[PDB]
């Protein structure tokens, strides 16, 4: 019953996103929302916003309204287009700073 959504170009570094997505692999869909709800990390907000699209797609598109037999089948974060800007530092030099992005994908399947 694989239904999935994903957010692309989400402005949070891939490692910081993986820190949270590695909690929500293979648990009940609702039980995963109740974990991202009470999660200190700031990446848990975009991730839970994608976890809700997956359930919304499962209910609407494929007519699996009951969102309690679902578990996270797949969830992974892919690298995204990095932005590059500079920073003035001591003695006239400049060090680069990369503002990384990520592509978060979540897949819910029936148990």
């Amino acid at each position: 019953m694989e239904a999935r959504a994903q957010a692309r170009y989400i402005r949070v570094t891939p490692m910081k996103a993986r820190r949270v997505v590695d909690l929500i692999r293979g648990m009940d869909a609702t039980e995963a929302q109740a974990v991202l709800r009470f999660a200190p990390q700031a990446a848990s907000v975009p991730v839970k916003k994608v976890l809700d699209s997956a359930i919304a797609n499962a209910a609407h598109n494929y007519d699996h309204t009951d969102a309690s037999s679902l578990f996270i089948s797949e969830a992974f974060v892919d690298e995204g287009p990095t932005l590059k800007r500079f920073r003035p530092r001591a003695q006239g030099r400049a060090y680069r700073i990369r503002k990384r992005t990520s592509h978060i994908t979540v897949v819910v399947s029936s148990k």
């Binding site: 820190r19 590695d22 999660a39």
Partner: peptide
């Protein structure tokens, strides 16, 4: 000090595994 060599993939990943969040 400065890194003497590029850290091998095995050694890099041994460490980053330790940078994990805890289930609430």
């Amino acid at each position: 000090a400065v890194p003497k060599r590029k850290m091998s993939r095995s050694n890099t990943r041994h460490r980053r595994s330790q940078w994990k969040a805890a289930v609430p």
